[PDB]
Design a protein around this ligand. Structure first.
Ligand SMILES: [K+]
Ligand SMILES: [K+]
Lengths: 405, 249, 398, 248
């Protein structure tokens, strides 16, 4: 069923007032295609037939519901709190990103679009988009920086096995920003037949709201499950925060539960005092970036500061505007977790529970262990385990000296 | 009350010509050399100068301008160097507006930057990633400090949005892009008498003249950057050719 | 009814299975057998296992109608049983959760296991970390040298990994070492065997832990399609995934059952791993079943682009089911497997294990045979993340 | 009634010594050299020779014997070469049993292998991976062709299984070990049967053989003979002479 709209933004995309967070900080050149997608999605998000299509794919293709696992062997490291892992690591493709691309790829076909484009950093969103496009028979083009294509030979081959074209952007700094630039320019030129699959809960309206809608399911499932297994609502629900899609998906269902604390864990890299981090809420300030007014890491002139993290998925200088709203409103707390804290949690989770998490998700695990110590014995903490760690085995093996030289 | 740039276009239309509108980014190839280039534009026959604020994540900038803005930033260019460039252009007898993405303005403070631009002699702001829907602070600052406000329209712009964008503009409206450009200008003229500048990857006298048949202003940027990279004399020669092109009789 | 006798024999006098093991192994084998007989009927044990299957491993796996393959399978309806979505990415988690729980019930503090390219090693190490058991994986030195990341996965999970440099330094020799380790360390060590072969009780126990696949699939296909399938198919290495999906359908007489095995360059070339198509009856690793063996009974080298279908033996319950006429076993080449791999990627966005791609290729052929509207359930035993480099080379994408 | 190797253990216990039982694998370092070495064991004072059938997958064997069986298989040894070896040993006046894993026997045919082992003069079969539980066909062939059947026991064997294994054996019981585990294992066989017991325990020297002849009816030696043959056939003879003198 179509879910309620109490936490939704206004028709301009603003959260918390007609000139607050979110909005559309974009060129007029993009507005025809942004208005077309917005109207398409206003129609489809209340259509029972669309929700049935999406539910059918979630169930049979992607394997939802994902389970909730009480990780009893972590307890001793979390102040004897109880850590429940929402297992998005078991989704098809190994993360929550499948929820998003299924929704958008279905919406692309409803709009009569034959072609989908997207961009990617390390490759994860690229692979997910390509996966959904293969399923629905859409032409798929992924833009990726030349420094990333050369360093991700196997993810490029995944995308190509899936039938997508990978365009290596060799201009400028040859990175994610140059790929984003090309995807937006492609979208404008080919708006007639082309849909842009935005990767996280950010960008211009309607993307923060749409992406969150397609991730709501995590939190909805988790609220039923935790009451099933613990016998009550949790004392806390937590998640890692890049752009913010996995976090907002798990948080949403708990928003009107005033006893449930909500905590997002962001990448502190080498440490927030070092200037090599991606701690947007902790060290950043309000500004317009990538189409929304939210928080970002910026210098005194408003240029974007380069961010650093051991994980690719959290290495983003911004954050989704719904999170900015939830911070200003006092509803969610955002806290920093270092590379080291994250890798310790990664390793702890492999040894203790036999689960290799994504390094991104390991930030949430590490923060959950700390939150456990604060709240003490018997506290119930739901952690979004946003992805599996197969892609990260080489990085983690080097960290722990398992490869040598 | 008239716009700040209105007399330039009245003066142009009374001499049967379009205004030449030249863009260069502050700090390319370094801060002093960019100021010398902007001053040279004034001397070579540019009616309005678009002083570009280099930004770290441009969406609209094509590859020539994007390479130059990246270099200017590697050189350590500051937003206050754009205010200094505006002072120099005004001192040279020029007319200057600033072209900028919105975040540097938000960071500076919108009211603060409007005041400091006006104090530097600037006549307006071109806002390629600011649409009227998000422009409430800017309209108040624009009116308070008497600055023209040039929003962009595009071939894809709906009638509803083209009307709102033209209504929110003062000075001129930037029609950015084979037959798409004169048709877009025609759609602006149908609802408003406001001057229209056209950007169309202009690199020659002949292209300036084609655009001057239907538009009040010819906007040039990429080609000026490409010329400056060669050297200041190439920029003077190009600007002279472009100035002859905007003149019909 | 489908179970063997107390000695482990299927089909009475044919004598499929049994215990062709040294006397030195028999104390520990009888100890596992008695412990299994006791726990298989204990409700506490089946409950613990069910709880882990659901909350830890992600069961039930879904059944997905791959409608974009249909045009490539003569318009039959191919339904994929998605064991690729399980924790660890294959059916093997099912086996190791059961055996690991058994080990802890037995009071064993140490678990050993063999592995080929690493799949059963990673699964075994996963289960042991979960349950707090010490884990040592045995892996042939030719394999450890070209699987550095899987070795690292096992180490990350807290397992030790021993490169076996004896015999031909691969899967069968790792198994040979693991059996020696078990004898020496029998007081405290449990051997988690990785397929539905070996001496009794492993073929029966492994099958019982893989039965859940077929039990789910039978229910799911009735729910979605309205009827039992026309065929259920699966790839066959040692035989654990196929026996798991086949078992619930054994007494449905209109359901065809087909196992697909690895033919490499082709059976006629000698470069294959096609145990039923080209092997013959023999005793191997404790089981009388089919075997790739020379005319003196020496084990021969098997070849396949798939590392998981290398095992030169096959489970004795499958040999019984072949003799009885209940299941057919058919060869699939490297080429057919890889064409089906690529096709599943482009059509459904599912990157299959190359093992599982043998079954998909077999399903496409069977679809053309049975015709429009036929319903074919295919066990998609694993995901193909591990095979991306192999597949990319095959298709000239590197 | 009486076993085939019975008269050999009778003759030894009457002469106040244990039988020396020497293993070599057929085909190491080649087929003719291995027969020359097995013949040299008869000449040097081995009472019973164990002719090993090389197998691609030997579970029970230590590293010396395994490398030798691997080398033998690389050189093309065939199961028939073992039967030819048994023939040559018998003609030279020696006493031969075959030691083999079961699959080669299955491939040959159990009945046919026993028929052809008996026709070569072979006296019995040691079966490291056949237990009495799977030995129905073998029991029948054993009785038909008058061959002894040497099953193995181990320290770990239960009282039930040890009794069944001894009851199913003829000739001798191999007490395979792998310090006081060997003698205890032998003691347990003795308490329920008068069948001779052979003990293998990585014997290297005169002193070590004598140590085992104190409690065991037969001293089994494999690894050391293979190590010795690798150095040379002269070294094998001298070592076998040391071991023959130790069992007295
Ligand atoms: K961030
Ligand atoms: K599931």
């Amino acid at each position: 069923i179509a879910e309620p709209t109490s936490h939704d933004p206004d028709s301009g995309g603003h959260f918390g007032g007609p000139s607050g967070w979110g909005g559309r900080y974009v060129p007029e050149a993009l507005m025809a295609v942004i208005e077309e997608v917005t109207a398409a999605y206003q129609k489809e998000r209340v259509s029972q037939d669309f929700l049935d299509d999406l539910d059918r794919l979630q169930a049979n293709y992607a394997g939802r519901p994902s389970p909730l696992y009480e990780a009893t062997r972590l307890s001793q490291h979390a102040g004897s709190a109880r850590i429940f892992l929402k297992r998005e690591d078991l989704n098809h493709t190994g993360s929550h990103k499948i929820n998003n691309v299924l929704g958008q790829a279905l919406l692309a076909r409803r709009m009569g679009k034959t072609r989908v484009i997207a961009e990617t950093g390390a490759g994860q969103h690229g692979v997910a988009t390509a996966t959904a496009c293969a399923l629905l028979g859409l032409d798929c083009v992924i833009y990726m920086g030349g420094i990333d294509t050369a360093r991700q030979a196997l993810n490029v081959a995944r995308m190509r096995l899936l039938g997508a074209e990978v365009v290596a952007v060799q201009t400028g700094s040859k990175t994610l920003k140059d790929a984003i630039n090309e995807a937006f320019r492609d979208w404008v030129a080919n708006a007639d037949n082309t849909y842009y699959c935005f990767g996280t809960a950010a960008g211009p309206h309607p993307f923060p709201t749409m992406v969150r809608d397609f991730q709501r399911i995590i939190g909805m499932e988790a609220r039923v499950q935790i009451q099933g297994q613990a016998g009550r609502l949790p004392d806390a629900v937590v998640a890692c925060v890049g752009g913010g899609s996995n976090a907002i998906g798990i948080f949403h269902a708990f928003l009107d539960d005033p006893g449930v604390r909500l905590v997002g864990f962001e990448a502190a890299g080498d440490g927030v005092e070092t200037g090599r981090h991606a701690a947007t809420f902790t060290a950043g300030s309000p500004g317009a970036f990538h189409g929304s007014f939210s928080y970002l890491l910026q210098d005194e002139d408003g240029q974007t500061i380069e961010s650093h993290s051991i994980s690719a998925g959290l290495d983003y200088p911004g954050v989704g505007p719904e999170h900015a709203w939830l911070k200003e409103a006092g509803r969610v707390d955002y806290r920093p977790i270092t590379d080291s804290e994250a890798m310790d949690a990664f390793g702890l989770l492999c040894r203790m529970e036999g689960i290799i998490p994504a390094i991104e998700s390991a930030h949430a695990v590490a923060g959950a262990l700390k939150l456990g110590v604060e709240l003490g014995r018997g506290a119930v903490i739901v952690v979004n385990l946003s992805g599996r760690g197969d892609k990260d085995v080489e990085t983690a093996a080097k960290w722990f000296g398992l490869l040598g030289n | 009350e008239a716009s700040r740039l209105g007399p330039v276009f009245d003066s142009c239309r009374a001499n049967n010509r379009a205004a030449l509108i030249g863009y260069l980014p502050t700090g390319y190839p370094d801060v002093p050399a960019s100021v010398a280039a902007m001053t040279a534009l004034v001397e070579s026959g540019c009616d309005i100068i678009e002083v570009g604020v280099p930004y770290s994540d441009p969406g609209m900038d094509g590859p020539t301008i994007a390479r130059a803005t990246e270099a200017a930033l590697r050189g350590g260019v500051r937003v206050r160097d754009t205010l200094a460039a505006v002072e120099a252009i005004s001192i040279a007898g020029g007319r200057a507006v600033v072209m900028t993405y919105w975040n540097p303005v938000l960071r500076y403070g919108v009211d603060a930057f409007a005041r400091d631009l006006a104090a530097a002699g600037g006549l307006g702001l071109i806002t390629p990633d600011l649409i009227p829907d998000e422009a409430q602070q800017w309209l108040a600052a624009s009116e308070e400090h008497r600055l023209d406000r040039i929003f962009l329209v595009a071939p894809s712009s709906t009638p509803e949005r083209l009307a709102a964008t033209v209504e929110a503009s003062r000075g001129f409206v930037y029609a950015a892009s084979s037959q798409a450009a004169p048709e877009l200008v025609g759609r602006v003229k149908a609802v408003s008498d406001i001057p229209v500048g056209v950007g169309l990857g202009v690199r020659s006298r002949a292209q300036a003249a084609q655009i001057a048949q239907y538009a009040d202003g010819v906007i040039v940027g990429s080609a000026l950057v490409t010329a400056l990279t060669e050297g200041l004399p190439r920029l003077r020669a190009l600007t002279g050719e472009l100035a002859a092109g905007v003149r019909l009789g």
